[PDB]
Ligand binder design. Structure first.
Ligand SMILES: [Cl-]
Length: 114
């Protein structure tokens, strides 16, 4: 199917992220991804909380078990509702934190961008 992709553009973003064609299981693990029983790898981080477990947003990413496609989204602190952290630059602290997190993935051959 088409739900896992090789590129993702977060809601509102001007950048697109691409899954590295050379992404490695052990590197995913080293960056904090957890492999589920299905073989897929997941990662989640809170963004810009006001108090413990009161995040403004969360970043979620899953890589498929075959290591050839991914999903990545921003949601609100409830972990479900789609969020747009970029529109009108209304959430700069969340964007800085997101970029910091993803910069590590760029440096370790997980994601690229244009
Ligand atoms: Cl499909």
């Amino acid at each position: 199917g088409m739900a896992y992709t090789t590129t993702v553009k977060l809601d509102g973003d001007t950048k697109t992220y691409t899954l590295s064609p050379t992404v490695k299981k052990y590197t995913l693990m080293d960056l904090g991804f957890v492999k589920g029983r299905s073989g897929a790898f997941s990662f989640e981080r809170s963004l810009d909380p006001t108090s413990p477990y009161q995040a403004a947003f969360k970043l979620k990413m899953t890589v498929n078990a075959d290591l050839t496609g991914f999903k990545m989204t921003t949601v609100t602190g409830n972990g479900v509702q789609r969020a747009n952290i970029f529109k009108n630059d209304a959430h700069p602290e969340a964007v800085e934190q997101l970029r910091y997190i993803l910069a590590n993935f760029i440096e370790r051959d997980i994601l690229t961008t244009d």
